[PDB]
Design a protein around this ligand. Structure first.
Ligand code: HHT
Ligand code: HHT
Ligand code: CL
Length: 130
């Protein structure tokens, strides 16, 4: 239906706003772009599913997210990718891990306060019946 179309547009709008709010945050600057295979060539080998805020945007835009659940699954990636790739004791790694996982926590905290549960549930049911 159109109803259902209006639901997904709303989701897309909501997800864009959340994503923008992470993107304008100085802490998260490094997550706004994919990793350049210059600086880091061994990345694209170790990290199977690269993920970042600009990709998240592309995916919103290409109607690739039908639920917030799916969105968060990508946000989880950004954190767990950093855990995986930058595991060392050194401060360069500790900082990246810290920033990536605060991104995750900020995303979750925003959604926990601003996402209507019934809206999520609706997206889930529409998606399930497709
Ligand atoms: C600096 O603004 C952004 C940067 C990235 Br990466 C994604 C999204 C936005 C804003 C928007 O999509 O509304
Ligand atoms: C971040 O936690 C959630 C994530 C999703 Br998806 C749906 C609901 C919640 C808790 C809430 O929205 O009350
Ligand atoms: Cl820095």
């Amino acid at each position: 239906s159109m109803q259902e179309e209006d639901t997904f547009r709303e989701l897309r709008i909501f997800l864009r706003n959340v994503t923008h709010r992470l993107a304008i945050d100085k802490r998260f600057r490094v997550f706004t772009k994919p990793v350049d295979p210059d600086e880091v060539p061994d990345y694209v080998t170790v990290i199977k599913q690269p993920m970042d805020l600009s990709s998240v945007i592309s995916k919103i835009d290409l109607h690739k997210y039908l639920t917030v659940k799916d969105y968060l699954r990508d946000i989880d990636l950004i954190c767990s990718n950093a855990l995986e790739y930058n595991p060392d004791r050194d401060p360069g790694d500790r900082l990246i891990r810290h920033r990536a996982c605060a991104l995750r926590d900020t995303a979750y905290a925003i959604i926990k306060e601003e996402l209507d549960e019934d809206f999520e549930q609706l997206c889930e049911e529409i998606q399930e019946s497709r």
